[PDB]
Scaffold this active site. Sequence first.
Site, short mmCIF file in Angstrom:
data_model
loop_
_atom_site.label_atom_id
_atom_site.label_comp_id
_atom_site.label_asym_id
_atom_site.label_seq_id
_atom_site.Cartn_x
_atom_site.Cartn_y
_atom_site.Cartn_z
N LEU A 1 63.61 69.20 73.85
CA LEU A 1 63.54 67.75 73.50
C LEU A 1 64.58 67.05 74.36
O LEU A 1 65.58 67.67 74.74
CB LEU A 1 63.86 67.63 72.00
CG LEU A 1 62.85 68.29 71.05
CD1 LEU A 1 63.14 67.86 69.60
CD2 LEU A 1 61.47 67.72 71.35
N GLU B 1 64.92 64.01 61.15
CA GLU B 1 63.63 63.77 61.85
C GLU B 1 62.85 65.09 61.90
O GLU B 1 61.63 65.17 61.58
CB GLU B 1 63.88 63.22 63.21
CG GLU B 1 62.82 62.30 63.83
CD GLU B 1 61.58 63.12 64.24
OE1 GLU B 1 61.90 64.20 64.79
OE2 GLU B 1 60.43 62.72 64.05
N1 LIG Z 1 58.84 65.26 71.11
C1 LIG Z 1 57.83 65.93 70.65
O1 LIG Z 1 57.21 65.57 69.62
C2 LIG Z 1 57.25 67.06 71.38
C3 LIG Z 1 55.95 67.69 70.87
C4 LIG Z 1 55.59 68.86 71.75
C5 LIG Z 1 56.30 69.20 72.79
N2 LIG Z 1 57.44 68.57 73.21
C6 LIG Z 1 58.08 69.02 74.51
O2 LIG Z 1 57.15 68.96 75.63
C7 LIG Z 1 57.36 70.10 76.48
C8 LIG Z 1 56.07 70.99 76.30
O3 LIG Z 1 55.08 70.06 76.70
P1 LIG Z 1 54.04 70.18 77.90
O4 LIG Z 1 53.30 68.97 77.86
O5 LIG Z 1 54.75 70.29 79.10
O6 LIG Z 1 53.28 71.48 77.52
P2 LIG Z 1 52.15 72.08 76.58
O7 LIG Z 1 51.09 71.08 76.35
O8 LIG Z 1 52.94 72.47 75.40
O9 LIG Z 1 51.74 73.36 77.45
C9 LIG Z 1 50.87 73.34 78.55
C10 LIG Z 1 49.98 74.62 78.60
O10 LIG Z 1 49.28 74.56 77.65
C11 LIG Z 1 47.88 74.99 77.86
N3 LIG Z 1 47.05 73.85 77.50
C12 LIG Z 1 47.56 72.62 77.38
N4 LIG Z 1 46.66 71.73 77.04
C13 LIG Z 1 45.46 72.54 77.07
C14 LIG Z 1 43.96 72.27 76.70
N5 LIG Z 1 43.46 71.07 76.38
N6 LIG Z 1 43.14 73.29 76.74
C15 LIG Z 1 43.67 74.48 77.08
N7 LIG Z 1 44.92 74.84 77.37
C16 LIG Z 1 45.77 73.80 77.34
C17 LIG Z 1 47.88 75.30 79.35
O11 LIG Z 1 48.41 76.58 79.46
P3 LIG Z 1 47.95 77.63 80.61
O12 LIG Z 1 48.65 77.04 81.84
O13 LIG Z 1 48.35 78.94 80.22
O14 LIG Z 1 46.53 77.28 80.75
C18 LIG Z 1 48.95 74.27 79.79
O15 LIG Z 1 49.71 74.71 80.97
C19 LIG Z 1 58.68 70.77 75.97
O16 LIG Z 1 59.76 70.02 76.64
C20 LIG Z 1 58.64 70.39 74.49
O17 LIG Z 1 59.98 70.36 74.02
C21 LIG Z 1 57.95 67.48 72.45
C1 LIG Z 2 56.57 72.10 67.40
C2 LIG Z 2 57.75 71.80 68.29
O1 LIG Z 2 58.88 71.51 67.43
C3 LIG Z 2 57.46 70.45 68.97
O2 LIG Z 2 58.47 70.19 69.85
C4 LIG Z 2 57.38 69.20 68.10
N1 LIG Z 2 58.56 68.58 67.76
C5 LIG Z 2 58.48 67.42 67.01
C6 LIG Z 2 57.24 66.99 66.60
N2 LIG Z 2 57.05 65.86 65.84
C7 LIG Z 2 58.24 65.20 65.42
N3 LIG Z 2 58.12 64.11 64.64
N4 LIG Z 2 59.43 65.71 65.79
C8 LIG Z 2 59.69 66.82 66.57
O3 LIG Z 2 60.87 67.18 66.89
N5 LIG Z 2 56.09 67.52 67.00
C9 LIG Z 2 56.23 68.60 67.70
#
Ligand SMILES: NC(=O)c1ccc[n+]([C@@H]2O[C@H](COP(=O)([O-])OP(=O)(O)OC[C@H]3O[C@@H](n4cnc5c(N)ncnc54)[C@H](OP(=O)(O)O)[C@@H]3O)[C@@H](O)[C@H]2O)c1
Ligand SMILES: C[C@H](O)[C@H](O)C1=Nc2c(nc(N)[nH]c2=O)NC1
Length: 186
Positions: A22, A30
């Site tokens: 994050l 949160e």
């Molecule tokens: N703030 C939040 O609420 C929140 C929520 C989630 C994540 N995050 C953050 O976001 C980052 C992870 O996010 P990201 O966007 O980079 O990655 P992701 O969506 O978690 O991962 C991507 C991998 O997922 C697979 N994939 C994704 N969408 C797909 C679909 N429609 N169909 C099939 N496979 C799919 C593919 O893997 P393959 O390459 O193996 O095909 C793609 O490379 C981390 O920094 C995490 O902390 C934050």
């Molecule tokens: C599942 C993993 O914790 C992922 O980063 C997510 N974090 C968050 C989330 N949603 C909220 N509201 N807050 C988080 O920190 N959805 C997904």
Amino acid sequence: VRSLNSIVAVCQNMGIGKDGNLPWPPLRNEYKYFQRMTSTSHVEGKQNAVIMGKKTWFSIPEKNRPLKDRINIVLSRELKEAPKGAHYLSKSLDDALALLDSPELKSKVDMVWIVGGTAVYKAAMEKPINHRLFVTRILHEFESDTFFPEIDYKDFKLLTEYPGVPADIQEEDGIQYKFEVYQKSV
Ligand SMILES: NC(=O)c1ccc[n+]([C@@H]2O[C@H](COP(=O)([O-])OP(=O)(O)OC[C@H]3O[C@@H](n4cnc5c(N)ncnc54)[C@H](OP(=O)(O)O)[C@@H]3O)[C@@H](O)[C@H]2O)c1
Ligand SMILES: C[C@H](O)[C@H](O)C1=Nc2c(nc(N)[nH]c2=O)NC1
Ligand SMILES: [Ca+2]
């Protein structure tokens, strides 16, 4: 499925992640909101399902996987088997959706939550199905390398209130945020 829910926390620049984690340090309250929302089912005997991408899966410390009390589905085009601890591996959202409706699951699952990342949110937002998006807006900017996709304000209407979601601006660790719920009706 009948309806989708997506949950995410975003900062002012729409960032959701940075270097695999994050963009902000831990916000306890949160995070407990996310846990409570995804974990709470309204039917005894059923559990919610959480769908996420491969990088999101691996962003969760190993000892904490799978997210307790929910069925964990990881999406991946490259993996062959579900990573250790996940319940199911699917190759696209469509497949995760068809799995959910299968006989063995259908009867076991209450809510379906989309927990990211980008490409996952985007795919779910585009399905012509009823969907509620729970957004935490963190009223600050943090450097980010991953962003939430653009929400169609013509489709997703902001609700002015919703059961069990605080209305006021929240604060914690010197940071303010607010909870919002958007609803798309087909
Ligand atoms: N703030 C939040 O609420 C929140 C929520 C989630 C994540 N995050 C953050 O976001 C980052 C992870 O996010 P990201 O966007 O980079 O990655 P992701 O969506 O978690 O991962 C991507 C991998 O997922 C697979 N994939 C994704 N969408 C797909 C679909 N429609 N169909 C099939 N496979 C799919 C593919 O893997 P393959 O390459 O193996 O095909 C793609 O490379 C981390 O920094 C995490 O902390 C934050
Ligand atoms: C599942 C993993 O914790 C992922 O980063 C997510 N974090 C968050 C989330 N949603 C909220 N509201 N807050 C988080 O920190 N959805 C997904
Ligand atoms: Ca890849």
